[PDB]
Symmetry: C3
């Protein structure tokens, strides 16, 4: 019935983002994505704590899907028979049927195909929402990601100037609720079903045990640090499907920030810390001016340093002494 060209997208694991154009001369197309649900026990910290995760495509967050305004997004959702629970998908970018959730419920062994038109620009959460108390449980178990709907002319600053990024990263923040036993050690479970009772009791007290980026403490540090060069404009897309976050780039700024994540609104300029409302994604762009290590954190510093919510950037380039200099190194007080 709908006769537009079709384009397949090969999704990639976060924090990377599949190849895409910013400004395009393509007209609308049907863009085809596939997500396969995987339920799996994973390690979430350096002490070896385990967690019953539920994921789109094996990752937390699920992959970033990128399209342009007026595209039709056609998603094949697959729930293999090796899973134990029904799942679905709700796109905050979509209109009707609970974001698609009412049309995508699939038992283990089934798949479904949903199409929605991308009428609203910005970055948006997607997540599983199977019904009732299951909705929060599936989301905080890892079943969330994001989709970016770009204007066809790319991003702008709201004063008529183009904003082009040199690279984009997707940082998905996940609040996790891992119960402790009487001795005070984290509990491990054999199945998501068995984790449910204890996990729900903890969830309703609203305090996470862990808050992590990309699924694990230290995921985006060391070999897996984010990278840039002095002079590069980097877009950081940040989502949180359940709980607020307050991103901050230590040693940098948000030069242009859409904290509510929606490109019909002009970005704010020159922020120190921005706010991602639980159930939303936002985006910040920064042109790096200095080399060295930066940390990207939520600026609840207890969550950042003690609960897991810290990423690093390693930046190459030349140090600018005009911007900052150590006038006198540490020395004994006169």
């Amino acid at each position: 019935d709908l006769k537009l060209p079709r384009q397949k997208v090969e999704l990639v694991a976060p924090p990377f983002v599949h190849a895409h154009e910013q400004a395009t001369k393509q007209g609308p197309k049907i863009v085809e994505f596939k997500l396969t649900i995987e339920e799996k026990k994973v390690v979430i910290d350096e002490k070896g704590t385990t967690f019953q995760a539920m994921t789109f495509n094996g990752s937390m967050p699920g992959p970033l899907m990128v399209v342009h305004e007026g595209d039709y997004v056609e998603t094949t959702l697959v729930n293999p028979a090796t899973n134990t629970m029904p799942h679905n998908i709700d796109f905050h970018s979509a209109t009707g049927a609970l974001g698609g959730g009412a049309l995508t419920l699939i038992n283990p062994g089934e798949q479904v195909v949903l199409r929605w038109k991308a009428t609203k620009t910005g970055v948006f959460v997607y997540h599983c929402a199977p019904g009732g108390p299951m909705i929060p449980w599936h989301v905080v178990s890892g079943m969330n990601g994001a989709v970016m709907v770009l204007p066809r002319d790319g991003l702008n600053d709201g004063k008529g100037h183009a904003l082009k990024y040199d690279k984009v990263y997707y940082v998905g923040e996940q609040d996790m609720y891992v119960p402790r036993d009487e001795k005070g050690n984290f509990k491990s479970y054999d199945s998501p079903g068995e984790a449910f009772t204890d996990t729900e009791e903890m969830m309703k007290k609203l305090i996470p045990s862990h808050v992590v980026f990309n699924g694990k403490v230290g995921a985006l540090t060391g070999k897996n640090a984010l990278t840039a060069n002095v002079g590069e404009n980097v877009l950081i897309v940040h989502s949180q499907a359940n709980r607020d976050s307050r991103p901050h780039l230590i040693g940098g700024h948000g030069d242009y920030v859409w904290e509510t994540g929606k490109f019909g609104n002009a970005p704010e300029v020159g922020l120190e810390t921005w706010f991602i409302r639980g159930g939303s994604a936002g985006a910040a762009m920064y042109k790096f001016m200095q080399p060295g290590i930066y940390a990207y954190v939520t600026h609840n510093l207890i969550e950042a340093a003690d609960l897991c919510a810290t990423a690093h950037f390693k930046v190459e380039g030349k140090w600018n002494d005009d911007l900052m200099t150590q006038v006198k190194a540490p020395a004994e007080i006169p």
Copy 2:
């Protein structure tokens, strides 16, 4: 002394709103409202948990009061002798005397009349504030509502285009603190005074037991779902007098949103989730494009699904397959 025409308003229970004009050719008037305090034990969940509520006009939230910029709002506050405590009222829309709280303290058996000029447009909280530790207790017991001060020319989009709503609903979100006994069951009390000690201990730990719309789990579901039709522009006013909230219309958007609630500022466009700061009201308008059920939630999904914060909309009209379609129904994986 002040010689303007007087107009009486018959308040209605939320989520409905008394009849009013958007744009008006009336000039300023003295608009007269009456609020009668009622203290009462109420049921707040489907399990039969009870709660010592304190309310304006018998409802949680108190009713929405609607006026226009430059009107004088004259409120008669009544504290009948059947109540046990002093009460007052603080309007965030008003200027001076702690929002009127310093001029409205009334013991059981008394009434008072306050007038304030509506110099600031937007939606604003009102709440009881009797002094000291009583202030939070009365507010989280249900003594809060909102008032909407419209521009005389009605709402606009900040680019010169009128925004007219077809209907308005008021959703008041209430964080409730109900203590549990040693067995882990919710406690019941014979009076608000007796609930005070246990309730205050719990309040200071900052985690609610319930978060509800319109006073009870499921208040705005079933027979009492909100309603609309495809093509209707609906304004949703949302208040939270004590704690943040992150409203989201599942399957829709906020087409025009004043998250800080104040109409001197242009609305933001095309939001997925917005943020209501504790101690404020905000407003979002959406033109429905699809029929069916929508849920309106705070997008802390634990609060929404497990603690009570979910409303429904039932929308009539024709399904738009261009916006969304199930391409292939659930079927066995090839």
Copy 3:
């Protein structure tokens, strides 16, 4: 190497702010500040609870530093030998080296001199950040303040009109984590090092025991109330280095508010309550219209009334009956 005029600033204790110009015809200069770290046991409430504080210049918050865009800020940080721990400083206003933290780590007995160029306007947090789990601990122990970077032409409303304040106050909000013993009394400790284990356990549960302005319950009340006169435009700078806050002036408004704190963005108008994201500072200006007492609170009313987060303003001038009047004093119900 850098040959600009030098200007020394004598810092003053909050909530006051050192003398400065708004709009200036001075060009860039090197502005020189000195901060001396002090670790000390302090009383934080009227019951006599003690707390192991760590401070810049002996105060919580540290003093407000005021400069203009394009100034170079040269800070001497001193860690006297009477202290027990290493410390450093991170300015959110600065670019590179973790905001200066990577260049300013000093042991007891040492000092360091850092210079950074003020390229971004607004109000910004500064705080200690010595590494790892120490980062949150030093911040919630009191090691944070703010710096205001003004445009050279002073503030404006984003529609071409100047906004000039008659006075400025700095309100620093501090979340404190004081553990309790088995009887339920607050614990006291002999050193910050000894407070660390118990304090960290409590911090990771994310619920503060106290939330205070200017370091103590009631700090900004009584003799130490903030003051103004009817007709005065007052700027209130508010910071929170770790946790969100929702400032509200009871009986007033935010006439012009930069909630994200950055003067490259136009202020919002006519707010009731605004939001300071943890890890940021914001600023609100209000022209007082009515005399009397006002309270300035975070509008989580439990935090304000029960945990310590309330300041007062005493305002002199003539009462305006047009804005508000008690039409009928409290009287028996007919």
